Amino acid sequence: DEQMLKRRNVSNQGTVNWSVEDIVKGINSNNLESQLQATQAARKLLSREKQPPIDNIIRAGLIPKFVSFLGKTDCSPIQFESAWALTNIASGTSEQTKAVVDGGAIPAFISLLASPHAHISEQAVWALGNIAGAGSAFRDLVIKHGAIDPLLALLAVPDLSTLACGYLRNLTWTLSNLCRNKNPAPPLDAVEQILPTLVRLLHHNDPEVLADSCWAISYLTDGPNERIEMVVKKGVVPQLVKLLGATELPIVTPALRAIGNIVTGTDEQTQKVIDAGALAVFPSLLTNPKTNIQKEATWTMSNITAGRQDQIQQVVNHGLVPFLVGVLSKADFKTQKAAAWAITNYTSGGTVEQIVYLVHCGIIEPLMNLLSAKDTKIIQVILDAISNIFQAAEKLGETEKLSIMIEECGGLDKIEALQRHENESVYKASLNLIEKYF
Protein backbone atom coordinates (compact mmCIF):
# COMPACT_ATOMS: atom_id res chain seq x y z
CA ASP A 1 0.00 0.00 0.00
CA GLU A 2 1.89 2.98 1.42
CA GLN A 3 5.08 2.30 3.33
CA MET A 4 7.89 3.81 1.12
CA LEU A 5 9.79 1.20 -0.86
CA LYS A 6 12.94 3.34 -1.19
CA ARG A 7 14.16 6.37 0.63
CA ARG A 8 16.53 9.08 -0.42
CA ASN A 9 18.61 10.80 2.39
CA VAL A 10 17.97 14.36 1.70
CA SER A 11 19.05 15.76 5.24
CA ASN A 12 31.40 23.69 3.95
CA GLN A 13 30.63 26.02 0.95
CA GLY A 14 33.73 24.46 -0.68
CA THR A 15 31.66 21.41 -1.88
CA VAL A 16 28.31 23.04 -2.89
CA ASN A 17 27.11 22.69 -6.49
CA TRP A 18 30.13 21.12 -8.23
CA SER A 19 29.79 19.86 -11.76
CA VAL A 20 30.04 16.14 -12.27
CA GLU A 21 33.20 16.56 -14.33
CA ASP A 22 34.80 18.34 -11.30
CA ILE A 23 33.72 15.48 -9.02
CA VAL A 24 35.33 12.99 -11.45
CA LYS A 25 38.52 15.08 -11.53
CA GLY A 26 38.75 15.07 -7.68
CA ILE A 27 37.94 11.38 -7.42
CA ASN A 28 40.61 10.49 -9.98
CA SER A 29 43.28 12.61 -8.28
CA ASN A 30 45.68 10.55 -6.38
CA ASN A 31 44.88 12.41 -3.16
CA LEU A 32 42.65 11.01 -0.49
CA GLU A 33 41.64 14.43 0.83
CA SER A 34 40.88 15.59 -2.73
CA GLN A 35 38.88 12.34 -3.18
CA LEU A 36 37.08 13.04 0.10
CA GLN A 37 36.06 16.59 -0.89
CA ALA A 38 34.86 15.48 -4.32
CA THR A 39 32.82 12.57 -2.78
CA GLN A 40 31.16 14.97 -0.37
CA ALA A 41 30.35 17.22 -3.39
CA ALA A 42 28.77 14.13 -5.11
CA ARG A 43 26.83 13.44 -1.85
CA LYS A 44 25.50 17.03 -1.88
CA LEU A 45 24.36 16.79 -5.50
CA LEU A 46 22.54 13.44 -4.70
CA SER A 47 21.03 14.89 -1.51
CA ARG A 48 19.43 18.03 -2.93
CA GLU A 49 15.63 18.48 -3.08
CA LYS A 50 15.00 18.42 -6.80
CA GLN A 51 16.08 16.06 -9.48
CA PRO A 52 19.37 14.70 -8.15
CA PRO A 53 21.58 13.82 -11.12
CA ILE A 54 21.73 9.99 -10.46
CA ASP A 55 22.16 8.95 -14.13
CA ASN A 56 24.99 11.42 -14.75
CA ILE A 57 26.86 10.13 -11.64
CA ILE A 58 26.36 6.53 -12.81
CA ARG A 59 27.36 7.47 -16.41
CA ALA A 60 30.53 9.17 -15.08
CA GLY A 61 31.62 5.66 -13.81
CA LEU A 62 31.63 6.81 -10.11
CA ILE A 63 29.95 3.84 -8.42
CA PRO A 64 33.04 1.58 -8.29
CA LYS A 65 35.12 4.34 -6.76
CA PHE A 66 32.48 5.03 -4.09
CA VAL A 67 32.31 1.31 -3.38
CA SER A 68 36.16 1.06 -2.90
CA PHE A 69 35.86 4.14 -0.56
CA LEU A 70 33.47 2.15 1.76
CA GLY A 71 36.54 -0.04 2.47
CA LYS A 72 38.66 2.89 3.70
CA THR A 73 38.74 2.02 7.44
CA ASP A 74 41.57 4.56 7.87
CA CYS A 75 39.29 7.46 6.59
CA SER A 76 35.82 7.25 8.19
CA PRO A 77 34.63 10.56 6.61
CA ILE A 78 35.02 9.18 3.08
CA GLN A 79 33.29 5.90 4.17
CA PHE A 80 30.36 8.05 5.39
CA GLU A 81 30.17 10.37 2.28
CA SER A 82 30.37 7.46 -0.17
CA ALA A 83 27.85 5.36 1.87
CA TRP A 84 25.40 8.29 1.66
CA ALA A 85 26.11 8.91 -2.06
CA LEU A 86 25.46 5.21 -2.84
CA THR A 87 22.36 5.04 -0.60
CA ASN A 88 20.89 7.91 -2.68
CA ILE A 89 21.78 6.20 -6.03
CA ALA A 90 20.15 2.98 -4.73
CA SER A 91 16.99 5.01 -3.82
CA GLY A 92 16.08 5.64 -7.58
CA THR A 93 14.70 3.17 -10.24
CA SER A 94 15.44 -0.51 -10.43
CA GLU A 95 18.13 0.01 -12.85
CA GLN A 96 19.82 2.66 -10.57
CA THR A 97 19.72 0.22 -7.59
CA LYS A 98 21.08 -2.47 -9.87
CA ALA A 99 24.10 -0.28 -10.88
CA VAL A 100 24.95 0.00 -7.09
CA VAL A 101 24.58 -3.74 -6.57
CA ASP A 102 26.64 -4.42 -9.75
CA GLY A 103 29.56 -2.34 -8.25
CA GLY A 104 29.91 -4.81 -5.37
CA ALA A 105 28.18 -2.59 -2.76
CA ILE A 106 26.30 -5.27 -0.91
CA PRO A 107 29.16 -7.05 0.92
CA ALA A 108 30.86 -3.65 1.41
CA PHE A 109 27.74 -2.28 3.14
CA ILE A 110 27.46 -5.40 5.22
CA SER A 111 31.08 -4.90 6.55
CA LEU A 112 30.14 -1.34 7.55
CA LEU A 113 27.34 -2.61 9.77
CA ALA A 114 30.22 -3.39 12.27
CA SER A 115 31.59 0.17 12.04
CA PRO A 116 32.23 1.84 15.41
CA HIS A 117 30.78 5.09 13.98
CA ALA A 118 26.97 5.02 14.43
CA HIS A 119 26.44 7.53 11.58
CA ILE A 120 28.26 5.24 9.20
CA SER A 121 26.65 1.82 10.20
CA GLU A 122 23.25 3.72 10.05
CA GLN A 123 23.92 4.73 6.42
CA ALA A 124 24.93 1.14 5.66
CA VAL A 125 21.58 -0.01 7.21
CA TRP A 126 19.68 2.55 5.09
CA ALA A 127 21.49 1.51 1.83
CA LEU A 128 20.81 -2.19 2.34
CA GLY A 129 17.04 -1.31 2.97
CA ASN A 130 16.99 0.53 -0.46
CA ILE A 131 18.67 -2.45 -2.12
CA ALA A 132 16.23 -4.98 -0.59
CA GLY A 133 13.45 -2.54 -1.56
CA ALA A 134 14.22 -2.93 -5.24
CA GLY A 135 12.65 -6.43 -5.36
CA SER A 136 12.61 -10.11 -4.19
CA ALA A 137 15.81 -11.16 -5.97
CA PHE A 138 17.91 -8.26 -4.46
CA ARG A 139 16.24 -8.78 -1.08
CA ASP A 140 17.33 -12.49 -1.14
CA LEU A 141 20.79 -11.55 -2.47
CA VAL A 142 21.24 -9.16 0.54
CA ILE A 143 20.17 -12.06 2.75
CA LYS A 144 22.52 -14.56 1.06
CA HIS A 145 25.47 -12.13 1.68
CA GLY A 146 24.70 -12.51 5.48
CA ALA A 147 23.04 -9.14 6.23
CA ILE A 148 20.53 -10.38 8.82
CA ASP A 149 22.92 -11.42 11.64
CA PRO A 150 24.83 -8.07 11.89
CA LEU A 151 21.47 -6.16 11.45
CA LEU A 152 19.90 -7.96 14.37
CA ALA A 153 23.08 -7.63 16.44
CA LEU A 154 22.61 -3.78 16.26
CA LEU A 155 19.29 -4.25 18.09
CA ALA A 156 20.66 -6.70 20.68
CA VAL A 157 20.33 -4.30 23.61
CA PRO A 158 18.49 -4.69 26.93
CA ASP A 159 16.19 -1.69 26.13
CA LEU A 160 15.51 -0.38 22.63
CA SER A 161 14.98 3.11 24.24
CA THR A 162 18.69 3.65 24.67
CA LEU A 163 19.30 3.64 20.88
CA ALA A 164 19.03 6.94 19.01
CA CYS A 165 15.60 7.26 17.71
CA GLY A 166 16.47 8.00 13.99
CA TYR A 167 18.91 5.02 14.11
CA LEU A 168 16.23 2.60 15.44
CA ARG A 169 13.69 3.81 12.89
CA ASN A 170 16.20 3.16 9.96
CA LEU A 171 16.88 -0.37 11.26
CA THR A 172 13.14 -1.17 11.65
CA TRP A 173 12.46 0.08 8.12
CA THR A 174 15.31 -1.87 6.53
CA LEU A 175 14.18 -5.05 8.40
CA SER A 176 10.62 -4.54 7.11
CA ASN A 177 12.02 -4.38 3.58
CA LEU A 178 13.64 -7.81 4.20
CA CYS A 179 10.11 -9.09 5.05
CA ARG A 180 8.54 -7.49 1.95
CA ASN A 181 7.58 -8.67 -1.55
CA LYS A 182 6.29 -11.92 -2.74
CA ASN A 183 7.25 -13.68 -5.72
CA PRO A 184 8.79 -15.46 -3.87
CA ALA A 185 8.23 -14.54 -0.25
CA PRO A 186 11.43 -14.28 1.87
CA PRO A 187 13.15 -17.54 2.91
CA LEU A 188 11.38 -19.29 5.74
CA ASP A 189 14.56 -19.40 7.85
CA ALA A 190 15.27 -15.65 7.34
CA VAL A 191 11.65 -14.92 8.49
CA GLU A 192 12.18 -17.13 11.59
CA GLN A 193 15.42 -15.43 12.33
CA ILE A 194 13.94 -11.91 12.04
CA LEU A 195 10.56 -12.52 13.78
CA PRO A 196 11.58 -12.31 17.48
CA THR A 197 13.25 -8.95 16.92
CA LEU A 198 10.15 -7.81 15.09
CA VAL A 199 7.88 -8.88 17.93
CA ARG A 200 9.97 -6.72 20.25
CA LEU A 201 9.88 -3.67 17.90
CA LEU A 202 6.09 -4.03 17.80
CA HIS A 203 6.11 -3.34 21.60
CA HIS A 204 8.33 -0.26 21.26
CA ASN A 205 6.66 3.14 21.99
CA ASP A 206 7.90 5.14 18.90
CA PRO A 207 5.01 5.66 16.46
CA GLU A 208 7.28 5.29 13.33
CA VAL A 209 8.91 2.06 14.66
CA LEU A 210 5.36 0.79 15.38
CA ALA A 211 4.11 1.61 11.88
CA ASP A 212 7.08 -0.01 10.12
CA SER A 213 7.00 -3.15 12.43
CA CYS A 214 3.34 -3.53 11.66
CA TRP A 215 4.01 -3.17 7.90
CA ALA A 216 6.70 -5.94 8.26
CA ILE A 217 4.10 -8.16 10.02
CA SER A 218 1.56 -7.41 7.36
CA TYR A 219 4.02 -8.55 4.64
CA LEU A 220 4.78 -11.77 6.51
CA THR A 221 1.04 -12.63 6.89
CA ASP A 222 0.28 -11.90 3.26
CA GLY A 223 0.73 -15.51 1.95
CA PRO A 224 -0.35 -19.17 2.52
CA ASN A 225 -1.59 -20.40 5.96
CA GLU A 226 1.83 -21.71 6.88
CA ARG A 227 3.23 -18.19 6.63
CA ILE A 228 0.35 -16.75 8.76
CA GLU A 229 0.95 -19.47 11.36
CA MET A 230 4.60 -18.60 11.97
CA VAL A 231 3.51 -15.03 12.86
CA VAL A 232 0.39 -16.04 14.79
CA LYS A 233 2.35 -18.65 16.93
CA LYS A 234 4.68 -15.85 18.10
CA GLY A 235 1.65 -14.50 20.07
CA VAL A 236 1.56 -11.08 18.30
CA VAL A 237 -2.23 -10.95 17.53
CA PRO A 238 -3.20 -9.24 20.87
CA GLN A 239 -0.53 -6.57 20.27
CA LEU A 240 -1.79 -6.10 16.72
CA VAL A 241 -5.40 -5.65 17.93
CA LYS A 242 -4.17 -3.09 20.40
CA LEU A 243 -2.36 -1.11 17.64
CA LEU A 244 -5.64 -1.39 15.55
CA GLY A 245 -6.97 0.85 18.20
CA ALA A 246 -4.22 3.51 17.92
CA THR A 247 -5.03 7.13 17.12
CA GLU A 248 -2.36 7.45 14.45
CA LEU A 249 -3.56 6.40 11.05
CA PRO A 250 0.00 5.37 9.86
CA ILE A 251 -0.21 2.72 12.62
CA VAL A 252 -3.90 1.70 12.14
CA THR A 253 -3.41 1.18 8.36
CA PRO A 254 -0.77 -1.63 8.64
CA ALA A 255 -2.23 -3.20 11.78
CA LEU A 256 -5.48 -3.50 9.96
CA ARG A 257 -3.79 -4.85 6.83
CA ALA A 258 -2.03 -7.57 8.99
CA ILE A 259 -5.30 -8.47 10.86
CA GLY A 260 -7.13 -8.60 7.40
CA ASN A 261 -4.39 -11.01 6.16
CA ILE A 262 -4.58 -13.21 9.25
CA VAL A 263 -8.29 -13.82 8.84
CA THR A 264 -7.84 -15.07 5.25
CA GLY A 265 -6.13 -18.15 6.83
CA THR A 266 -7.79 -20.99 8.78
CA ASP A 267 -10.78 -20.77 11.09
CA GLU A 268 -8.46 -21.34 14.00
CA GLN A 269 -6.23 -18.39 12.93
CA THR A 270 -9.34 -16.25 12.38
CA GLN A 271 -10.41 -17.28 15.97
CA LYS A 272 -7.21 -15.83 17.44
CA VAL A 273 -8.18 -12.49 16.10
CA ILE A 274 -11.70 -12.75 17.60
CA ASP A 275 -10.34 -14.00 20.97
CA ALA A 276 -7.89 -11.09 21.05
CA GLY A 277 -10.81 -8.60 21.03
CA ALA A 278 -10.53 -7.34 17.45
CA LEU A 279 -14.33 -7.20 16.86
CA ALA A 280 -14.85 -4.46 19.49
CA VAL A 281 -12.77 -1.96 17.40
CA PHE A 282 -14.91 -2.56 14.32
CA PRO A 283 -17.69 -0.07 15.04
CA SER A 284 -15.02 2.67 14.66
CA LEU A 285 -13.19 1.00 11.72
CA LEU A 286 -16.39 0.56 9.80
CA THR A 287 -17.27 4.25 10.28
CA ASN A 288 -13.72 5.54 9.84
CA PRO A 289 -13.41 8.92 8.02
CA LYS A 290 -10.48 7.35 6.07
CA THR A 291 -12.12 5.55 3.14
CA ASN A 292 -9.30 2.95 2.74
CA ILE A 293 -9.66 1.92 6.48
CA GLN A 294 -13.44 1.48 6.08
CA LYS A 295 -12.89 -0.50 2.87
CA GLU A 296 -10.24 -2.83 4.47
CA ALA A 297 -12.18 -3.14 7.66
CA THR A 298 -15.17 -4.35 5.62
CA TRP A 299 -13.13 -6.85 3.57
CA THR A 300 -11.78 -8.13 6.93
CA MET A 301 -15.39 -8.55 8.09
CA SER A 302 -16.30 -10.47 4.94
CA ASN A 303 -13.54 -13.00 5.68
CA ILE A 304 -14.81 -13.33 9.23
CA THR A 305 -18.46 -13.79 8.07
CA ALA A 306 -17.06 -16.61 5.80
CA GLY A 307 -16.16 -18.37 9.11
CA ARG A 308 -17.97 -20.87 11.35
CA GLN A 309 -21.43 -20.22 12.72
CA ASP A 310 -19.98 -19.50 16.20
CA GLN A 311 -17.79 -16.83 14.49
CA ILE A 312 -20.76 -15.30 12.63
CA GLN A 313 -22.38 -15.30 16.12
CA GLN A 314 -19.58 -13.18 17.58
CA VAL A 315 -20.04 -10.71 14.74
CA VAL A 316 -23.79 -10.59 15.75
CA ASN A 317 -23.01 -10.25 19.52
CA HIS A 318 -20.51 -7.38 18.96
CA GLY A 319 -23.35 -5.43 17.29
CA LEU A 320 -21.54 -5.40 13.90
CA VAL A 321 -24.55 -6.34 11.69
CA PRO A 322 -26.12 -2.85 11.92
CA PHE A 323 -22.68 -1.49 10.97
CA LEU A 324 -22.68 -3.73 7.80
CA VAL A 325 -26.13 -2.46 7.03
CA GLY A 326 -24.70 1.11 7.46
CA VAL A 327 -21.76 0.47 5.06
CA LEU A 328 -24.11 -1.21 2.50
CA SER A 329 -26.43 1.85 2.71
CA LYS A 330 -23.81 4.52 2.25
CA ALA A 331 -20.10 4.16 1.63
CA ASP A 332 -17.54 4.46 -1.12
CA PHE A 333 -18.65 2.00 -3.88
CA LYS A 334 -15.60 -0.24 -3.26
CA THR A 335 -16.60 -0.56 0.41
CA GLN A 336 -20.26 -1.29 -0.53
CA LYS A 337 -18.85 -4.10 -2.74
CA ALA A 338 -16.97 -5.53 0.20
CA ALA A 339 -20.11 -5.25 2.36
CA ALA A 340 -22.08 -7.09 -0.33
CA TRP A 341 -19.51 -9.95 -0.08
CA ALA A 342 -19.64 -9.90 3.67
CA ILE A 343 -23.47 -10.35 3.51
CA THR A 344 -23.34 -13.12 0.92
CA ASN A 345 -20.74 -15.03 3.00
CA TYR A 346 -22.79 -14.43 6.16
CA THR A 347 -25.94 -15.79 4.43
CA SER A 348 -24.13 -18.67 2.88
CA GLY A 349 -22.80 -19.90 6.26
CA GLY A 350 -25.16 -18.61 9.01
CA THR A 351 -28.03 -20.50 10.74
CA VAL A 352 -31.71 -19.67 10.01
CA GLU A 353 -31.85 -17.52 13.11
CA GLN A 354 -28.70 -15.52 12.16
CA ILE A 355 -30.08 -14.87 8.61
CA VAL A 356 -33.48 -13.80 9.92
CA TYR A 357 -31.65 -11.32 12.26
CA LEU A 358 -30.03 -9.70 9.21
CA VAL A 359 -33.42 -9.00 7.66
CA HIS A 360 -34.54 -7.60 11.09
CA CYS A 361 -31.52 -5.18 10.99
CA GLY A 362 -32.77 -3.84 7.64
CA ILE A 363 -30.41 -5.59 5.17
CA ILE A 364 -33.06 -5.88 2.42
CA GLU A 365 -33.56 -2.37 1.26
CA PRO A 366 -29.86 -1.27 0.97
CA LEU A 367 -29.17 -4.64 -0.80
CA MET A 368 -31.84 -3.93 -3.40
CA ASN A 369 -30.67 -0.37 -3.86
CA LEU A 370 -27.32 -1.81 -4.91
CA LEU A 371 -28.93 -3.92 -7.67
CA SER A 372 -28.63 -0.64 -9.71
CA ALA A 373 -24.82 -0.86 -9.85
CA LYS A 374 -23.00 -0.98 -13.18
CA ASP A 375 -20.78 -3.75 -11.92
CA THR A 376 -21.84 -7.09 -12.85
CA LYS A 377 -19.88 -8.95 -10.11
CA ILE A 378 -21.69 -7.22 -7.19
CA ILE A 379 -25.12 -8.07 -8.89
CA GLN A 380 -24.18 -11.79 -8.82
CA VAL A 381 -23.19 -11.37 -5.18
CA ILE A 382 -26.47 -9.70 -4.08
CA LEU A 383 -28.71 -12.09 -6.06
CA ASP A 384 -26.84 -14.88 -4.41
CA ALA A 385 -27.52 -13.39 -0.97
CA ILE A 386 -31.21 -12.84 -1.77
CA SER A 387 -31.39 -16.49 -2.80
CA ASN A 388 -29.77 -17.48 0.45
CA ILE A 389 -32.12 -15.40 2.56
CA PHE A 390 -35.16 -16.89 0.70
CA GLN A 391 -33.89 -20.32 1.48
CA ALA A 392 -33.90 -19.51 5.23
CA ALA A 393 -37.35 -17.97 4.84
CA GLU A 394 -38.67 -21.19 3.24
CA LYS A 395 -37.45 -23.19 6.21
CA LEU A 396 -39.75 -21.07 8.38
CA GLY A 397 -42.64 -20.76 5.87
CA GLU A 398 -42.20 -16.97 5.63
CA THR A 399 -41.25 -16.73 2.00
CA GLU A 400 -44.25 -14.51 1.20
CA LYS A 401 -43.43 -11.81 3.82
CA LEU A 402 -39.95 -11.50 2.29
CA SER A 403 -41.36 -11.14 -1.18
CA ILE A 404 -43.71 -8.35 -0.14
CA MET A 405 -40.78 -6.62 1.62
CA ILE A 406 -38.60 -6.99 -1.53
CA GLU A 407 -41.40 -5.62 -3.68
CA GLU A 408 -42.25 -2.89 -1.13
CA CYS A 409 -38.94 -1.13 -1.57
CA GLY A 410 -38.44 -1.29 -5.39
CA GLY A 411 -36.67 -4.66 -5.28
CA LEU A 412 -38.85 -6.70 -7.62
CA ASP A 413 -38.66 -3.86 -10.16
CA LYS A 414 -34.98 -4.75 -10.45
CA ILE A 415 -34.87 -8.49 -10.16
CA GLU A 416 -37.26 -8.29 -13.17
CA ALA A 417 -35.27 -5.68 -15.06
CA LEU A 418 -32.29 -8.11 -14.60
CA GLN A 419 -33.80 -10.99 -16.51
CA ARG A 420 -32.90 -9.01 -19.68
CA HIS A 421 -29.28 -8.56 -18.35
CA GLU A 422 -26.60 -9.32 -20.84
CA ASN A 423 -24.73 -11.65 -18.46
CA GLU A 424 -25.90 -15.25 -18.20
CA SER A 425 -25.41 -16.08 -14.43
CA VAL A 426 -27.31 -12.89 -13.63
CA TYR A 427 -30.67 -13.50 -15.46
CA LYS A 428 -30.61 -17.19 -14.51
CA ALA A 429 -30.60 -16.30 -10.80
CA SER A 430 -33.08 -13.46 -11.52
CA LEU A 431 -35.54 -15.67 -13.45
CA ASN A 432 -35.11 -18.34 -10.81
CA LEU A 433 -36.08 -15.98 -7.96
CA ILE A 434 -38.88 -14.31 -9.95
CA GLU A 435 -40.54 -17.58 -10.84
CA LYS A 436 -39.54 -19.42 -7.63
CA TYR A 437 -40.97 -16.65 -5.23
CA PHE A 438 -42.99 -14.07 -7.14
From Swiss-Prot:
Slightly detected in brain but not in cerebellum and skeletal muscle, highly expressed in testis and spleen. It is found in: Cytoplasm; Nucleus. SMART domains: ARM. Keywords: Acetylation, Cytoplasm, Nucleus, Phosphoprotein, Protein transport, Repeat, Transport, Ubl conjugation. GO terms for cellular component: cytoplasmic stress granule; cytosol; glutamatergic synapse; host cell; NLS-dependent protein nuclear import complex; nucleoplasm; postsynaptic density. Pfam families: Arm, Arm_3, IBB. GO terms for biological process: entry of viral genome into host nucleus through nuclear pore complex via importin; positive regulation of viral life cycle; postsynapse to nucleus signaling pathway; protein import into nucleus. ARM repeats lie at residues 13-53, 54-93, 94-135, 142-186, 188-224, 225-264, 267-306, 309-351, 352-398, 399-438. InterPro entries: ARM-like, ARM-type_fold, Arm_3, Armadillo, Importin-a_IBB, Importin-a_IBB_sf, Importin_alpha. Residues 84-180 are annotated as: NLS binding site (major). Residues 257-345 are annotated as: NLS binding site (minor). Signal peptide: none annotated. One of its GO terms (molecular function) is DNA-binding transcription factor binding. A motif (Nuclear localization signal) lies at residues 2-11. It comes from the Eukaryota. Ubiquitinated. Deubiquitinated by USP22; leading to stabilization and increased activity. Functions in nuclear protein import as an adapter protein for nuclear receptor KPNB1. Binds specifically and directly to substrates containing either a simple or bipartite NLS motif. Docking of the importin/substrate complex to the nuclear pore complex (NPC) is mediated by KPNB1 through binding to nucleoporin FxFG repeats and the complex is subsequently translocated through the pore by an energy requiring, Ran-dependent mechanism. Belongs to the importin alpha family. Consists of an N-terminal hydrophilic region, a hydrophobic central region composed of 10 repeats, and a short hydrophilic C-terminus. The N-terminal hydrophilic region contains the importin beta binding domain (IBB domain), which is sufficient for binding importin beta and essential for nuclear protein import. The IBB domain is thought to act as an intrasteric autoregulatory sequence by interacting with the internal autoinhibitory NLS. Binding of KPNB1 probably overlaps the internal NLS and contributes to a high affinity for cytoplasmic NLS-containing cargo substrates. After dissociation of the importin/substrate complex in the nucleus the internal autohibitory NLS contributes to a low affinity for nuclear NLS-containing proteins. Heterodimer; with KPNB1. Component of a complex containing CSE1L, RAN and KPNA2. Interacts directly with CSE1L. Interacts with PLAG1. Interacts with APEX1 (via N-terminus). Interacts with FRG1 (via N-terminus). Interacts with ARL4A, CTNNBL1 and NBN. Interacts with ANP32E. Interacts with SNAI1 (via zinc fingers). Interacts with SNAI2 (via zinc fingers). Interacts with BAG6. Interacts with AIFM2; this interaction likely mediates the translocation of AIFM2 into the nucleus upon oxidative stress. Interacts with RSL1D1. This is Importin subunit alpha-1. It comes from Mus musculus (Mouse).
